[PDB]
Amino acid sequence: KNIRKPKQERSIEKRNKILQVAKDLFSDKTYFNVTTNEIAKKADVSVGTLYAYFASKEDILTALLKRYNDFFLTTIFADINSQDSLDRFKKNPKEWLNVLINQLLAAEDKIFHAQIEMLAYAIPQAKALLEEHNNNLKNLTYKCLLYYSDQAANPSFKTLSLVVFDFISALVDELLYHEHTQEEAHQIKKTGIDSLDLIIKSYL
Amino acid sequence: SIEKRNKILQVAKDLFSDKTYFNVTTNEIAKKADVSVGTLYAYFASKEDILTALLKRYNDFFLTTIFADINSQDSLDRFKKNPKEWLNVLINQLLAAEDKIFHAQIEMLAYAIPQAKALLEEHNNNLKNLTYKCLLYYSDQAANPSFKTLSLVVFDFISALVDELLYHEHTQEEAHQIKKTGIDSLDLIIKSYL
C-alpha cells in the first residue's frame, strides 16, 4: 500500500484519458460524428466503464467546457484584464491594439475552440461559455475607454466597446482560421490596427 | 412528383432549423412531410442529399438576388458617389437577408461538412471581391494590393456588425446605436484610404 507510485489514482488517470480522447475526437471529427463506442475504444476502457464516469456524451462535453473556461481565464484573459491594458490604452490606443491582438492571436487550443463555436449553435452550455468570454473582453475594452478620460460610466463607450471588440475579434479570426502568406498576414494586421485606431480615436 | 419534392425540402429545412441537423433523421422528415420512408428515399438517398439540395438552392438564391444587386454597375456608381450611402444600402440588405434562420444552421454545418464550409467561403470571397472592385472603381485603378487587403478587413467588419445585430438581443435604442456606430466607423476607415 505505501510503496513508490504516482500520487494520482488510477480512476483519475482513466477519467483524464477519457476526456483527452474525447476532446481530440471532437476536435478532429466534430462532436456529432463521434460515438460513445469510439471514445471508449480509443481510451482503452470498456463502454460500461465509460458510462460509470460519464452518463452521456454531453456530460463529457460539460467537463471539457469547464476546463476550457479555466484555460481561457488563466492563459488568455488574465494578461488582457490587467491595469497594464488600461495604462497602455491611456498612453496610446494604438499600442493597446497591437498588444491585445497579439494576445488573442497567441491564444492556444484554437482547434477545440472552433468546436465550441460550432456547438454554440446547438448546445446551450457552449453558447453561454463563449458569450461570457466575449462579454468579459467587451467589459475590459469598456474599462480601457473609461480609463482614457477617467470616467465612471458612459453608455456611448459601452456601445463602442461592443463594436470595437466585434471588429477586433473579426480581425483575429481572419488571421487565425484562414490561409494567408506571412506578408499578407502582416498587411491585414497593419490595416486592421491602423483602422481600429482611427475609429477609437474618433469617439474619445 | 415535383410538388412533393418541394414539400419535403420545405419540411426538412424547417426541421433542420428547429432541431439541429445532426439530430434529424430521414424517418423524421418522412413522418413530418406525411410521406413514406420509401418515397422519401426515392427523392433523396440520404439526409446529406437533402442538405445538398437546400445548399444548392441557397447558392442560386444568393447568386441571383442578393449578390447580383451588390455586384451590379449601379452598386459601383453608388460607392463612387458616396461610400457611406453604399454602406447604408449594403448593410440594410444584409440585415434583411431572407432565410436567416436556416443560414445560421449552414454556419454551424460549415464546421463539419466541407461543402457547407466551401459554399459560405465562396459567398464571403465574392462579397470581398466586390468590395475590392468598389475601391478600384472609386480610384479608377485596375489593381491595388492595399485595397485588396482593405477589402478583406472592411468586409470582415461589415459581417461582424451584421451578426452582432442579427444574433443578439438589444433594446431598440441600443440596436440603433450599434448600427450607427458601426456604419460611421466603416465609412471613416474606407475614406481614410481613399
Measured between beta carbons, the chain B residues lying within 8 angstroms of A121 are: 20, 104-105, 107-108
Q: Please check whether residue B153 touches A, CB under 8 A.
A: yes
Domain ranges, residue B181: 46-194
Q: Is the same domain home to B2 and B77? A: no
Q: Is the same domain home to B56 and B11? A: no
Q: Is the same domain home to A169 and A197? A: yes
Rg (CA), chain A: 21
- A103 part of a folded domain: yes
Q: What is the resolution of this structure in A?
A: 1.9
Cβ distance B159 to A170 less than 8 Å, yes or no, reads yes
What is the DSSP secondary-structure string of chain B? -HHHHHHHHHHHHHHHHHH-GGG--HHHHHHHTT--HHHHHHH-SSHHHHHHHHHHHHHHHIIIIIIHHHTSHHHHHHHHH-HHHHHHHHHHHHHT-TTHHHHHHHHHHTTT-HHHHHHHHHHHHHHHHHHHHHHHHHHT-S--HHHHHHHHHHHHHHHHHHHHHHHS---HHHHHHHHHHHHHHHHHHHHHH-
Assess contact for A99 and A88: CB atoms under 8 A: yes
Q: Is the same domain home to A137 and A72? A: yes
Measured between beta carbons, the chain B residues lying within 8 angstroms of A203 are: 181
Q: Is the same domain home to A61 and A16? A: no
Cβ distance B111 to A122 less than 8 Å, yes or no, reads no
Q: Is the same domain home to A145 and A73? A: yes
Q: Is the same domain home to A71 and A44? A: no
Q: Is the same domain home to A65 and A106? A: yes
Assess contact for B53 and B156: CB atoms under 8 A: no
- Cα distance between residue A45 and residue A34, in whole Å: 16
- Cα distance between residue A32 and residue A119, in whole Å: 9
Q: Is the same domain home to B38 and B59? A: no
Asked how this structure was determined, the answer is X-ray
CATH of the domain at A20: 1.10.10.60
Q: Please check whether residue B175 touches A, CB under 8 A.
A: no
Q: Which residue from A204, A47, A180, B4 is spatially nearest to A192, judged by alpha carbons?
A: A180
Q: How far from each other are the two terminal CA atoms of chain B, in whole angstroms?
A: 55
| CA distance, residue B2 to nearest chain A CA (Å) | 32
Q: Please check whether residue A185 touches B, CB under 8 A.
A: no
User: Looking at the 3D structure of chain B, how many domains does it have?
Assistant: 2
Q: Which three cell numbers stand for residue B127?
A: 462579397
Q: Is the same domain home to B158 and B127? A: yes
Q: Please check whether residue A187 touches B, CB under 8 A.
A: yes
Q: Which residue from A54, A56, A61 is spatially nearest to A120, judged by alpha carbons?
A: A61
